[PDB]
Every structure is written in structure tokens, then in C-alpha cells.
Amino acid sequence: ELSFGARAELPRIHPVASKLLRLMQKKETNLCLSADVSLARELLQLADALGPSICMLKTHVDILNDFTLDVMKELITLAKCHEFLIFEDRKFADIGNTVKKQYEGGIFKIASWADLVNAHVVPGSGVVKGLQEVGLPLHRGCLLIAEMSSTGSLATGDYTRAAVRMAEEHSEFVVGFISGSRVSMKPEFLHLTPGVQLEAGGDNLGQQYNSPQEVIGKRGSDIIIVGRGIISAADRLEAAEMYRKAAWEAYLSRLG
């Protein structure tokens, strides 16, 4: 097992993965903030205050009541200042010809500001081929959704294996997974795990939580994605630091 800093130098590493792994090592953070807010001002205030604590800020641009491309410009300023990647959790899941348009165009112009996006594998590899036509020239990366945190997820068994094969066959663009665990044995790939809180529980709409120690330490994932465990807390900075320290120590203790 290699450190994040050594994985950043692997021969087959994608440049976006390398940039991420280097800043994870530098800042001692494997925390991705899930910035699940509806106001641009709250998004930017969280990005600025929590930027030093996070390796990545995950967006849902389509829930931002006051989205503009200028908001994204300000978020990029903070991402560059504090050193974190921007991941738009768009979950592209259409035919290749459609997702290329959804990624490059429309009002969001996601490819113009998102370092990372993700895709479901259920449509077959055309979803990746469509995205990569926009993303490769724009030097972007993609995560494939191999496992999901929600109750009744069908992303199990052969489905998960199909996601890993699709990633390993599109390594010029796919840099890792959304998963609950390590699903690829290739250290070039990132594993990002949502459904994370310190306390046991879930929500009323099928979300299930596991702890940072469980998903990083026992299940071998790289990065925790945390929304409400931070966002709903009174002090979001202290909450982010709790999650960062939990995920970082779980990583160190698996390393030895």
C-alpha cells in the first residue's frame, strides 16, 4: 500500500488524480465537503472557511437557487487559494450523444469549472465516451458510480464489476469511483465514499450512514464525502475538522 503522495507519482496516474493526491498529502485531508446548500453566499462562505480542511468540494449546481457562472468563478478562486478540487455530482446517466451536451453546454457549462464529474454505468460505456469527448480536451476527470449508499441500491455484484471494468478501460478520463469500499485493486484509481457520519443512522429517504473509520479503515476507501454531518452542524468548521481528523487517521492506520 502506497501513501497518497506516492500514488500521485504512479506511472498511469491521471493528472487530475495526481493534483488531488498531492494536495491531500500536503494538507493532511481526505475529506470532500458535500456543499448541499441552495444559496450561492452560503456555498462560497463554506468554501472559504472549510477550504483549508478539505481536498474537494462537491456541488449539486442544479439545487443552487441563484446559480450564475460568476458564482463558479468565485468558487474557483477559493479552490485555487485553499487548494481543493471541484466535483459536480451530476451523475450523468444518458446516452453518449446527450451527456456530451449536458456536460459542455446549457446554462451550467459544467465542464468549464468542474475538475471532476461522475457518471452512472447503467447506460453502457457510451456514457463515458460521450463525456470524454468534452472532458479529455478540457483536461478533466470522471468518477464512475460503482456502489451507492442508499437502501435498495442495485449497484452490487456484476454491476459493480462492470463499473470497475469500464473505468479500467477508460483510464485516460476515468480517475476513480463513487463506492462504499475499495472496488479496484489498481492504486491509480480514487475511491470516494458518501453516506458518512460519525453517528449511526440514516435519513427518511433511504440514505444510510457509516463512519469514517469503517469506510476508510475497514473498507479501504480513500476519501469521505460528508454533507449534513457538517452542513447541519452549528459550527461547520469544527465539524469539518472532526471529519478530516477521523478520515486522515483511519488512512494512516491502514498504511501502518
Next chain:
Amino acid sequence: ELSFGARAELPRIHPVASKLLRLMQKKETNLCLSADVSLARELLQLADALGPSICMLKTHVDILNDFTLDVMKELITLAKCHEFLIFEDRKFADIGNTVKKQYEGGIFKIASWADLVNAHVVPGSGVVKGLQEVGLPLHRGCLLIAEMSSTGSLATGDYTRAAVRMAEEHSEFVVGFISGSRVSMKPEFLHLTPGVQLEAGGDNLGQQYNSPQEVIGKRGSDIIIVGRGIISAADRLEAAEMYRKAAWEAYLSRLG
């Protein structure tokens, strides 16, 4: 087998399905236009000219370069005038808590103007529960993606069966399927089939085509969804009429 007009009266029919089936029978159309354009003016000119020929206009609001809510008001005026449903092909595919916000909120406010949306079943039934918490109060309907037209689709076998079970257990909100074929034996459910052209072929990014006669007549689906077969033609009205007549006669001949 019942006519569209008789299916509109079934005891368990959803009001959105009933409205659709009645206008399909009245206008002799089971064609859904896939309005895959980037200009509001082209979207509205197609909706106006092709409105009499279609039962439904399917949008990808996120590829419109000049989206505003006033464009959607103008589209609703045309939908009411010519009598067709608006279907936003958003393919919701996240946890329930997230999709409720993506459906109601953000810039697009999809639930405010879309009669129908669709969802992938891969996250489990929380995706439907989240949507239905916005959609039920707004008297909307949902389609579940049971099969996909693209090469390498994983929406087969047990996956398709899971989509049918999820639909039949959420019949207060789910009105049918995106599928390549009849997947439910319950006549209350609509089957809408994309990947349709008169000529054999595909695209460069995994799309596969079958004819209206194949998908309506042999595979037992209700509605054809047609994009490029119409949109890329010079005379889009004549193209829509050719697809309408093909799908309608295939339906009549299976009725006998």
C-alpha cells in the same frame, strides 16, 4: 388489449396518464418528439409546428443555452393549445433527499412546468419517494427507466424486473416506463420507447435504432420517442407525420 381511450378510463389510471391517453386517442398520435435543440426559439417553433402531430414533447432543459422560466411558460401555452404533455428527460438518479431538491428547485424548477419526469431505479426506491414528495402535491407523474436503447445497457433481466416492481409499488406517482418493449402486464402503465428511426442504424456513441413497427407492433410499446430522425430532417413536420403514421398504424394493427 384495450385502446388508448379505454385505458384512459381504467380504475387505477393516474390522472396524468389518463390525460395523455385521451389526447393520444383524440389526435391519433403516439409520437413523443425528443426536442434535442440548444435554442429556445427552435424549441418553441418545433413545439408549435409539430404540436398537432405529437402526444408529448420531451425536453433536456439542461442543454438549452438560453433557458429561462419564461421559455417554459411559452412551451406550456403551446402544450395547452395543441394538447401534448411536457416530459423533462432528467433521469433523476441520486438519493431521495437530493432528487427532491433537483426536481423542485434550482434554476430550472422542473416540477413547476414538467407534466412528466423520469428516474433511474439503480439507487433504490428512495429516488421515487424523494421525487413523489414534490410531484404528488403538484399532481405530476414519473416514468421509471426499465430498459435503455444504448449499447452495453445493464438495464436487463433482474434490473428490469426491479424497475417494474418499483413502479407497481408507487402507482400513485409512477405512470409507466422508459423501455424497449412492454415490460409490465398492467395496462394502467405507459411504455415509452426511445432509440427509434425508420432506417436501420445507430450513432457513434452507442445509440441503437429500431423501427416504429418493431417497437410498437412486435415489442408492444405504446409511444415512440424520436429525436434526430425528426430534428435532423429538412422538413421536420413531414418527418413527424411519417413517424406518427408509422407508430399509430403499428398500434392499430396490434389492437386488431
